[PDB]
Swiss-Prot record, chain A:
Belongs to the ATPase B chain family. It comes from the Bacteria. The chain holds residues 2 to 53 of 156 of the full protein. F-type ATPases have 2 components, F(1) - the catalytic core - and F(0) - the membrane proton channel. F(1) has five subunits: alpha(3), beta(3), gamma(1), delta(1), epsilon(1). F(0) has three main subunits: a(1), b(2) and c(10-14). The alpha and beta chains form an alternating ring which encloses part of the gamma chain. F(1) is attached to F(0) by a central stalk formed by the gamma and epsilon chains, while a peripheral stalk is formed by the delta and b chains. F(1)F(0) ATP synthase produces ATP from ADP in the presence of a proton or sodium gradient. F-type ATPases consist of two structural domains, F(1) containing the extramembraneous catalytic core and F(0) containing the membrane proton channel, linked together by a central stalk and a peripheral stalk. During catalysis, ATP synthesis in the catalytic domain of F(1) is coupled via a rotary mechanism of the central stalk subunits to proton translocation. Component of the F(0) channel, it forms part of the peripheral stalk, linking F(1) to F(0). Signal peptide: none annotated. It is found in: Cell inner membrane. The chain crosses the membrane at residues 10-30. The lineage of its organism: Bacteria, Pseudomonadati, Pseudomonadota, Gammaproteobacteria, Enterobacterales. This is ATP synthase subunit b.
Amino acid sequence: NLNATILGQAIAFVLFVLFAMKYVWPPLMAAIEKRQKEIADGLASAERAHKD
Amino acid sequence: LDLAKASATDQLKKAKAEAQVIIEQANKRRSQILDEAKAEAEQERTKIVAQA
């Protein structure tokens, strides 16, 4: 008898905001630093390598 | 870096090796001569003291 939609949508938006943001965020960041830190890390250690 | 280093050490090593190899060979020659010479001087003293 009450509007009642936005309540459920909102709570699901809370718990699910947590679960989802949590799930994707760490992987994508580790992908960022994975990439920059990848071409990077290789280049640097390899620079020590070549130079030395 | 890696393959380079390998060849560099390996090389300068080997170069040293043949270098000394020759050096000892030649030294062996100077010995060989000065030996033969020594023999000659021997022959000389021989004849001299003799007809003397």
